[PDB]
């Protein structure tokens, strides 16, 4: 064995040994339990960053831990290759997005292989390849036939100067990012997933996820935004029907989640697009200007929660169906057309938004809810005004004295008796718009025929291949200007027709890639039935909480869609979630590596430290160890050159330790079996050993805290250094300690542990398996305790080292000599000195 640690030499050698053994190249082996450990596949931007390193080391630690415990572990890797960053690099360097993407994949793959991740590279996928996206095109056409995917006009942001559609992330102050021209709102036909049909399923199935973080489930619930409220109809007064047609001439319909406060309504508010707003503003210019300012605004919830709530009266009146009061209709900028009825009631006494709105305009505030002892001040807002669990109704006539739910049910029955309302469930969730006016994305498998309409491409003709020899320029998608692409024949009539030129939301590819990993070479479906039945669902998912909402929601939606199609039989894709904290680095006034002598490392400010320089300078094991040791996985990690130095010296210490042990007599059989007769020092070392094994096993398997597991192995080595292991039984225990230490650290730093193991033991490491805990090594020695009766030694008892004072009291009173000297009398007191004596008085 060589004396000094050389990661540049041993890490390539250890990587080829694993590759030649094909331990990571797994199949649907029914003779072993499966474990699917998935890390979020990266966008092939060009180079890895320490964020990738931390994420994929965490996944590799869990994967290698399960492999050592005898699991058939699948840890697949892939490339989220579609999206804008390639389209922006295409216009910068004048290259095709495909060639720019494949150059990055090939390079980033070599960077990943040099880190030693136990990856099944035979299951690699690239989402921009037709062999992949043909199956999301297939699912598109199948759901299109069922109406789950439909075509409908939607609003987009049009740039009149750049001649392109812009996302809201590129529209600032009503203007284009790289143009600055006033952005128009255009209605164009687009495609949507009817995800609202699955809202109740997407909400309730969260209860099945017993191992998800509670805040992630909370974020999913708030995004869906289910509310159980009441539809309420206010009859339009006789004097307020001018110019109103249809149902809008008779009643104003609103939606409310507080029908228990309907007796407290003092006014109602409609959206600027509501027919009551249009009819009232017909001869009032002040209302026409208000409606225009509302339309010329942002429905962005961010801007809406920060905007000044404004309103103007209309002079039109509606009638409350419970108490008969005539209420004036206001046009308000916070009422949104398209959400519910486009109109709401207002209860300023029990809704904070309505209180401030009515405080500005001096509208009445009628209390209809009391919370026991609290006092109601119409000029102040307390937090209990909107209390829904402890409130009780007042000023409600029939409903006085009821709680929220009882008043809810009673108002429901009263409104249905008069035909003026009914219970209604609503969701803030809107349908999922698929269409993107971009080139570098999955083509939409629709053919437009002037005789047949929007026609789906038959399954025999899939995929619709995206042409790769394209250099986008940013002034409109090139597909709309390529007649050789969109000119086609209608698959229903055969006449001249046009292909859809929009591409798909890149969230589509990440919504089902975890299933494609199960059979990435399958050509008869999204995923083969056999591999789907074997792998089931993802056992462990590792990625940012930034994706806790849309990505997870879309992935869960696609899982149920594919299940309903009979492709899979699981309800949820991910059983467990691990969210790693971001990696941060000091900024300088550019990469710190190009600098000589603190925010998230991202492409935005180019703070990302290139892992390849750390690998060349210290090796992959030093990189992996520093990531897992600096902080818990969920906690943020700060880049520290001092941190990578301490990690490398520990690996030098681990190497030096095994070398010095083998220099002093070579390898022997590891100690095992009965440890009676071992010296006290060697028993304590074995106790520390199997205590460390239990602690590392618990930190990998349950807590998923890797920094503490490394610290535990460090403590075991510290006690090893202070232990004389020169004797024959001493050498046997030293062999047992080192054989476990290198296996406990193998998931973190597999390169050095693989090399050290084969110098210690001739068997394959992954066949010796995860170290077991010898429970006998955890039992400490027994102690003899003196028994006293009124201070006189009456006998002795043999006590356990873990015995409580109650155990010594129980054992001291059972002593024969005690009972004989106690003369059948009780003890007014029983003093207990643990580990010395117990005296009964």
Q: Which long-range contacts (CB under 8 A, 24 or more apart) does 643-650 make?
A: 644/614, 644/618, 647/618, 647/622, 648/618, 648/619, 648/622, 650/625, 650/714
Q: Could you tell which of ligand ATP, Zn ion, none binds residue 492, using a CB distance below 5 to 8 A set by kind?
A: Zn ion
693 contacts 740 by C-beta, under 8 angstroms? yes
580 binds ligand ATP (CB under 6 A): yes
Q: What 3-state class would DSSP assign to 463?
A: coil
Closest distance to ligand ATP from the beta carbon of 294 (Å): 12
CA 267, CA 255: separation in Å to the nearest integer? 14
42 binds ligand ATP (CB under 6 A): yes
DSSP string, 202-241: HHHGGGG-TTS-HHHHHHHHHHH-EEEEEEEEEEEPTTS-
Closest distance to Zn ion from the beta carbon of 490 (Å): 3
CA 244, CA 276: separation in Å to the nearest integer? 7
Q: How far is CA 150 from CA 145, 200, 241, 437, 680, in A?
A: 9, 20, 37, 17, 76
Among 37, 77, 263, 335, binds ligand ATP (CB under 6 A): 335
768 contacts 28 by C-beta, under 8 angstroms? no
Among 64, 123, 134, 258, binds ligand ATP (CB under 6 A): 258
336 binds ligand ATP (CB under 6 A): yes
CA 133, CA 122: separation in Å to the nearest integer? 18
Find the binding residues for ligand ATP in span 488-547 (CB under 6 A).
543-544, 546
Among 257, 454, 461, 719, binds ligand ATP (CB under 6 A): 257
Find the binding residues for ligand ATP in span 53-112 (CB under 6 A).
54-55
Q: Could you tell which of ligand ATP, Zn ion, none binds residue 452, using a CB distance below 5 to 8 A set by kind?
A: Zn ion
The neighbouring-strand residues paired with 229 are: 424
Q: For Zn ion, give the closer residue by CB, 448 or 690.
A: 448
Closest distance to ligand ATP from the beta carbon of 338 (Å): 7
Q: For ligand ATP, give the closer residue by CB, 506 or 519.
A: 506
Q: Could you tell which of ligand ATP, Zn ion, none binds residue 543, using a CB distance below 5 to 8 A set by kind?
A: ligand ATP
Q: Consult the annotation and say whether 142 binds a ligand.
A: no
Straight-line distance from the first to the last Cα atom of the chain, in angstroms, rounded to the nearest whole number:
67
CA 719, CA 689: separation in Å to the nearest integer? 9
Q: Could you tell which of ligand ATP, Zn ion, none binds residue 429, using a CB distance below 5 to 8 A set by kind?
A: none
Name the segment binding ligand ATP (CB under 6 A); options: 37-45, 277-285, 705-713, 738-746: 37-45
Closest distance to Zn ion from the beta carbon of 546 (Å): 44
Structure tokens at 182: 């006033």
CA 690, CA 713: separation in Å to the nearest integer? 11
Find the binding residues for ligand ATP in span 453-472 (CB under 6 A).
none
Q: For Zn ion, give the closer residue by CB, 394 or 492.
A: 492
Q: For Zn ion, give the closer residue by CB, 497 or 744.
A: 497
Residues 6 or more apart whose Cβ sits within 8 Å of residue 409: none
Q: How far is CA 586 from CA 211, 599, 639, 817, in A?
A: 35, 7, 8, 73
The label of the residue with tokens 């939301």 reads 505
Closest distance to ligand ATP from the beta carbon of 231 (Å): 11
CA 523, CA 112: separation in Å to the nearest integer? 28
Q: For ligand ATP, give the closer residue by CB, 600 or 652.
A: 600
Closest distance to Zn ion from the beta carbon of 446 (Å): 12
Structure tokens at 415: 């409104």
Find the binding residues for ligand ATP in span 105-164 (CB under 6 A).
none
CA 735, CA 666: separation in Å to the nearest integer? 10
443 binds ligand ATP (CB under 6 A): no
The neighbouring-strand residues paired with 120 are: none
Binding mask 209-228 for ligand ATP (x = CB under 6 A): ----------------x-x-
The neighbouring-strand residues paired with 149 are: 193
Closest distance to Zn ion from the beta carbon of 268 (Å): 50
CA 618, CA 837: separation in Å to the nearest integer? 58
Q: For ligand ATP, give the closer residue by CB, 100 or 255.
A: 255
- Provide the binding-site residues for ligand ATP, judged by CB under 6 A: 40, 42-43, 51-52, 54-55, 225, 227, 229, 255-258, 334-336, 339-340, 342, 344, 426, 428, 543-544, 546, 580, 582-583, 600-601
Name the binding residues for ATP.
603
Name the binding residues.
603
């Amino acid at each position: 064995m060589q004396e000094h640690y050389q990661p540049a030499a041993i890490e390539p050698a250890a990587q080829k040994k694993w590759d030649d053994a094909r331990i990571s190249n797994v199949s649907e082996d029914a003779s072993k339990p499966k474990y699917y450990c998935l890390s979020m596949f990266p966008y092939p931007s060009g180079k890895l960053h320490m964020g990738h390193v931390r994420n994929y080391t965490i996944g590799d630690v869990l994967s290698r831990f399960k492999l050592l415990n005898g699991f058939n572990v699948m840890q697949p890797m892939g490339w989220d290759a579609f999206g804008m960053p390639a389209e922006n690099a295409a216009m910068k360097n004048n290259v095709a997005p495909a060639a720019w993407t494949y150059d990055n994949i090939e390079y980033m793959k070599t960077q990943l292989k040099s880190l030693g991740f136990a990856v099944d590279w035979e299951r690699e996928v690239a989402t921009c390849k037709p062999e992949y996206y043909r199956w999301e095109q297939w699912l598109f056409t199948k759901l299109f036939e069922k109406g789950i995917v439909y075509r409908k006009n939607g609003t987009v942001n049009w740039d009149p100067v750049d001649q392109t559609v812009l996302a809201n992330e590129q529209v600032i102050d009503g203007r284009g990012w790289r143009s600055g021209a006033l952005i128009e709102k255009r209605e164009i036909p687009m495609y949507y997933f009817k995800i609202t049909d699955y809202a109740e399923e997407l909400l309730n199935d969260l209860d099945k996820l017993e191992h998800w973080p509670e805040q992630v489930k909370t974020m999913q619930r708030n995004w869906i935004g289910k509310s159980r409220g009441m539809t309420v109809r206010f009859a339009v007064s006789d004097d307020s029907k001018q110019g109103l047609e249809g149902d809008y001439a008779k009643f104003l319909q609103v939606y409310t989640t507080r029908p228990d406060t309907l007796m407290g309504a003092t006014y109602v508010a409609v959206a600027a697009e509501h027919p009551l707003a249009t009819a009232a503003a017909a001869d009032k210019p002040e209302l026409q200007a208000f409606i225009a300012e509302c339309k010329a605004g942002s429905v962005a919830e961010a801007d809406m929660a920060t905007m000044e709530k404004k309103g103007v009266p209309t002079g039109r009146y509606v009638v409350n169906p419970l108490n008969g009061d005539k209420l004036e209709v206001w046009i308000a900028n916070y009422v949104l057309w398209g959400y519910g009825d486009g109109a709401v009631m207002a209860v300023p006494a029990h809704d904070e938004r309505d209180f401030e709105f009515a405080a500005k305009y001096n509208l009445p505030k009628k209390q209809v809810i009391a919370v026991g002892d609290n006092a109601f001040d119409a000029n102040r807002w307390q937090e209990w005004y909107g209390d829904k669990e402890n409130g009780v109704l007042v000023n409600s006539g029939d409903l006085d004295g009821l709680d929220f739910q009882t008043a809810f049910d009673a108002v429901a029955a009263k409104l249905q008796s008069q035909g003026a309302g009914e219970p209604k469930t609503q969701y803030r969730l809107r349908d999922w718009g698929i269409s993107r006016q971009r080139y570098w994305g999955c083509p939409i498998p629709i053919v437009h025929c002037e005789k047949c309409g929007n026609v789906p491409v038959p399954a025999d003709q899939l995929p619709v291949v995206l042409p790769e020899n394209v250099v986008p320029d940013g002034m409109g998608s090139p597909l709309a200007k390529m007649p050789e692409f969109y000119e086609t024949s209608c698959p229903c009539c055969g006449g001249a027709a046009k292909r859809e030129t929009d591409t798909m939301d890149t969230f589509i590819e990440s919504s089902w890639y975890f299933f494609r990993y199960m059979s990435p070479k399958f050509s008869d479906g999204m995923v083969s039935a056999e591999s789907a039945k074997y792998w089931g669902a993802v056992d462990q998912y590792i990625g940012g909480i930034e994706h806790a909402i849309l990505h997870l929601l879309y992935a869960r939606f696609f899982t149920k869609l594919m299940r309903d199609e009979g492709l899979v039989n699981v309800d949820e894709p991910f059983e467990r979630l691990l969210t790693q904290g971001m990696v941060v680095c000091e900024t300088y006034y550019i990469n710190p590596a190009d600098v000589e002598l603190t925010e998230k490392m991202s492409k935005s400010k180019n703070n990302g430290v290139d892992p390849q320089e750390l690998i060349n300078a210290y090796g992959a094991d030093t990189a992996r160890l520093f990531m897992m040791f600096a902080a818990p996985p969920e906690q943020s990690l700060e880049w520290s050159d001092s941190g990578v130095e301490g990690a490398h010296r520990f690996l030098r210490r681990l190497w030096r330790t095994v070398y010095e042990y083998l220099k002093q007599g070579g390898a022997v059989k590891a100690f095992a079996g009965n440890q009676d007769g071992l010296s006290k020092e060697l028993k304590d070392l074995r106790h520390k050993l199997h205590s460390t094994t239990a602690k590392v096993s618990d930190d990998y398997g349950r807590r998923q805290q890797f920094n503490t597991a490394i610290a535990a192995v460090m403590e075991l080595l510290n006690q090893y250094d202070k232990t004389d292991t020169g004797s024959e039984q001493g050498r046997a225990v030293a062999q047992e300690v080192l054989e476990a230490a290198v296996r406990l650290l193998w998931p973190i730093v597999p390169h050095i542990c693989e090399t050290l193991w084969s110098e210690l033991n001739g068997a394959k490491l992954w066949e010796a398996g995860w170290p077991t805990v010898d429970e006998a090594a955890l039992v400490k020695s027994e102690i003899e305790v003196m028994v006293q009766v009124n201070g006189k030694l009456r006998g002795k008892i043999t006590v356990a080292a873990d015995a409580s004072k109650a155990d010594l009291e129980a054992a001291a009173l059972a002593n024969e000599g005690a009972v004989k000297f106690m003369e059948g009398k009780p003890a007014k007191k029983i003093i207990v000195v643990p580990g010395r004596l117990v005296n009964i008085v």
